[PDB]
Design a protein around this ligand. Structure first.
Ligand code: HEM
Length: 128
Protein backbone atom coordinates (compact mmCIF):
# COMPACT_ATOMS: atom_id res chain seq x y z
CA UNK A 1 0.00 0.00 0.00
CA UNK A 2 1.01 3.63 -0.52
CA UNK A 3 2.71 5.21 2.49
CA UNK A 4 0.99 8.23 4.13
CA UNK A 5 0.95 9.34 7.73
CA UNK A 6 -2.02 8.41 9.74
CA UNK A 7 -2.57 12.13 10.21
CA UNK A 8 -3.07 12.54 6.45
CA UNK A 9 -4.98 9.26 6.20
CA UNK A 10 -7.68 10.48 8.52
CA UNK A 11 -7.92 13.93 6.96
CA UNK A 12 -5.33 15.91 8.89
CA UNK A 13 -5.96 19.17 10.69
CA UNK A 14 -9.64 19.44 9.98
CA UNK A 15 -10.40 15.98 11.27
CA UNK A 16 -8.31 16.46 14.39
CA UNK A 17 -10.03 19.75 15.14
CA UNK A 18 -13.49 18.33 14.75
CA UNK A 19 -12.58 15.23 16.71
CA UNK A 20 -11.17 17.14 19.66
CA UNK A 21 -14.16 19.44 19.83
CA UNK A 22 -16.52 16.48 19.86
CA UNK A 23 -14.39 14.52 22.28
CA UNK A 24 -14.29 17.20 24.98
CA UNK A 25 -18.01 17.71 24.82
CA UNK A 26 -18.32 14.00 25.67
CA UNK A 27 -15.67 14.17 28.36
CA UNK A 28 -17.42 17.08 30.01
CA UNK A 29 -20.59 14.95 30.20
CA UNK A 30 -18.97 11.79 31.41
CA UNK A 31 -19.40 11.03 35.12
CA UNK A 32 -16.19 8.97 35.28
CA UNK A 33 -14.17 11.76 33.68
CA UNK A 34 -15.84 15.10 34.40
CA UNK A 35 -14.60 15.42 37.95
CA UNK A 36 -10.89 14.85 37.17
CA UNK A 37 -10.73 17.17 34.19
CA UNK A 38 -10.68 20.99 34.54
CA UNK A 39 -14.10 22.64 34.41
CA UNK A 40 -12.85 24.73 31.54
CA UNK A 41 -11.51 22.40 28.89
CA UNK A 42 -10.20 25.11 26.62
CA UNK A 43 -6.57 24.54 27.45
CA UNK A 44 -6.93 20.78 27.50
CA UNK A 45 -8.48 20.74 24.06
CA UNK A 46 -5.75 22.99 22.72
CA UNK A 47 -3.09 20.66 24.04
CA UNK A 48 -4.85 17.57 22.76
CA UNK A 49 -5.21 19.03 19.30
CA UNK A 50 -1.46 19.67 19.34
CA UNK A 51 -0.70 16.27 20.76
CA UNK A 52 -2.86 14.24 18.43
CA UNK A 53 -1.43 16.13 15.45
CA UNK A 54 2.06 15.08 16.47
CA UNK A 55 0.99 11.63 17.56
CA UNK A 56 -0.48 10.96 14.14
CA UNK A 57 2.69 11.99 12.32
CA UNK A 58 1.71 15.60 11.66
CA UNK A 59 3.86 18.54 12.71
CA UNK A 60 5.37 18.28 16.26
CA UNK A 61 3.04 20.93 17.64
CA UNK A 62 2.81 19.64 21.14
CA UNK A 63 6.54 19.35 21.80
CA UNK A 64 7.07 22.85 20.38
CA UNK A 65 4.85 24.36 23.01
CA UNK A 66 4.94 21.98 25.96
CA UNK A 67 8.03 19.81 25.62
CA UNK A 68 8.12 16.04 25.32
CA UNK A 69 4.70 14.44 25.86
CA UNK A 70 5.95 12.03 28.58
CA UNK A 71 2.29 11.22 28.70
CA UNK A 72 2.38 8.42 31.22
CA UNK A 73 4.30 10.63 33.63
CA UNK A 74 1.92 13.52 33.16
CA UNK A 75 -0.97 11.19 33.88
CA UNK A 76 0.48 9.96 37.15
CA UNK A 77 -1.08 13.13 38.55
CA UNK A 78 -4.50 11.44 38.22
CA UNK A 79 -6.07 8.16 39.18
CA UNK A 80 -6.50 6.37 35.86
CA UNK A 81 -8.26 3.11 36.48
CA UNK A 82 -9.20 0.71 33.68
CA UNK A 83 -12.77 2.00 34.08
CA UNK A 84 -11.59 5.52 33.45
CA UNK A 85 -9.55 4.40 30.46
CA UNK A 86 -12.67 2.73 29.13
CA UNK A 87 -14.62 5.91 29.68
CA UNK A 88 -12.03 7.95 27.82
CA UNK A 89 -12.01 5.45 24.94
CA UNK A 90 -15.82 5.33 24.87
CA UNK A 91 -15.91 9.12 24.58
CA UNK A 92 -13.38 8.88 21.81
CA UNK A 93 -15.35 6.30 19.87
CA UNK A 94 -18.50 8.39 20.34
CA UNK A 95 -16.67 11.51 19.12
CA UNK A 96 -15.27 9.65 16.09
CA UNK A 97 -18.76 8.42 15.29
CA UNK A 98 -20.24 11.91 15.80
CA UNK A 99 -17.87 13.60 13.37
CA UNK A 100 -18.51 10.80 10.90
CA UNK A 101 -14.94 9.45 10.97
CA UNK A 102 -15.16 5.79 10.00
CA UNK A 103 -12.96 3.23 8.30
CA UNK A 104 -9.59 1.61 8.56
CA UNK A 105 -7.57 4.76 9.19
CA UNK A 106 -10.00 5.58 11.99
CA UNK A 107 -9.55 2.14 13.46
CA UNK A 108 -5.78 2.21 13.16
CA UNK A 109 -5.79 5.54 14.99
CA UNK A 110 -8.27 4.25 17.57
CA UNK A 111 -6.06 1.21 18.17
CA UNK A 112 -3.08 3.45 18.82
CA UNK A 113 -5.23 5.27 21.34
CA UNK A 114 -6.30 1.96 22.97
CA UNK A 115 -2.62 1.19 23.48
CA UNK A 116 -1.78 4.68 24.78
CA UNK A 117 -4.80 4.62 27.10
CA UNK A 118 -3.69 1.23 28.41
CA UNK A 119 -0.23 2.72 29.05
CA UNK A 120 -1.86 5.59 30.98
CA UNK A 121 -3.72 3.26 33.37
CA UNK A 122 -2.03 3.55 36.75
CA UNK A 123 -4.38 2.30 39.40
CA UNK A 124 -6.41 -0.88 39.91
CA UNK A 125 -10.16 -0.63 39.42
CA UNK A 126 -12.52 0.04 42.31
CA UNK A 127 -14.52 -3.08 43.01
CA UNK A 128 -17.26 -3.44 45.67
C1 HEM B 1 -6.76 6.65 29.72
C2 HEM B 1 -7.57 7.59 30.22
C3 HEM B 1 -7.15 9.04 30.35
C4 HEM B 1 -7.56 9.87 31.30
C5 HEM B 1 -8.55 9.55 32.44
C6 HEM B 1 -6.93 11.16 31.06
C7 HEM B 1 -7.09 12.27 31.84
C8 HEM B 1 -6.38 13.40 31.63
C9 HEM B 1 -6.47 14.58 32.45
C10 HEM B 1 -7.40 14.76 33.67
C11 HEM B 1 -5.62 15.48 31.98
C12 HEM B 1 -5.37 16.90 32.52
C13 HEM B 1 -5.96 17.91 31.55
C14 HEM B 1 -5.47 19.33 31.78
O1 HEM B 1 -4.75 19.62 32.79
O2 HEM B 1 -5.78 20.20 30.93
C15 HEM B 1 -4.97 14.89 30.82
C16 HEM B 1 -3.99 15.52 30.11
C17 HEM B 1 -3.57 15.09 28.89
N1 HEM B 1 -3.92 13.93 28.26
FE1 HEM B 1 -5.03 12.45 29.10
N2 HEM B 1 -6.16 11.02 29.92
C18 HEM B 1 -6.26 9.74 29.44
C19 HEM B 1 -5.70 9.24 28.32
C20 HEM B 1 -5.04 9.97 27.36
C21 HEM B 1 -4.70 9.52 26.03
C22 HEM B 1 -5.01 8.12 25.42
C23 HEM B 1 -4.08 10.56 25.45
C24 HEM B 1 -3.53 10.69 24.02
C25 HEM B 1 -3.45 9.70 23.14
C26 HEM B 1 -4.03 11.66 26.38
C27 HEM B 1 -3.46 12.86 26.10
C28 HEM B 1 -3.37 13.88 27.00
C29 HEM B 1 -2.62 15.09 26.75
C30 HEM B 1 -1.87 15.46 25.47
C31 HEM B 1 -2.78 15.89 27.99
C32 HEM B 1 -2.19 17.26 28.25
C33 HEM B 1 -0.89 17.11 29.05
C34 HEM B 1 -0.44 18.50 29.41
O3 HEM B 1 -0.97 19.11 30.39
O4 HEM B 1 0.42 19.02 28.64
N3 HEM B 1 -4.64 11.28 27.53
N4 HEM B 1 -5.47 13.62 30.65
Amino acid sequence: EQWQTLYEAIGGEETVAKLVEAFYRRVAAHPDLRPIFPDDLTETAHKQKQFLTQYLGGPPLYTAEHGHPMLRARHLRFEITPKRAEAWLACMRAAMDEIGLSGPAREQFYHRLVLTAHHMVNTPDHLD
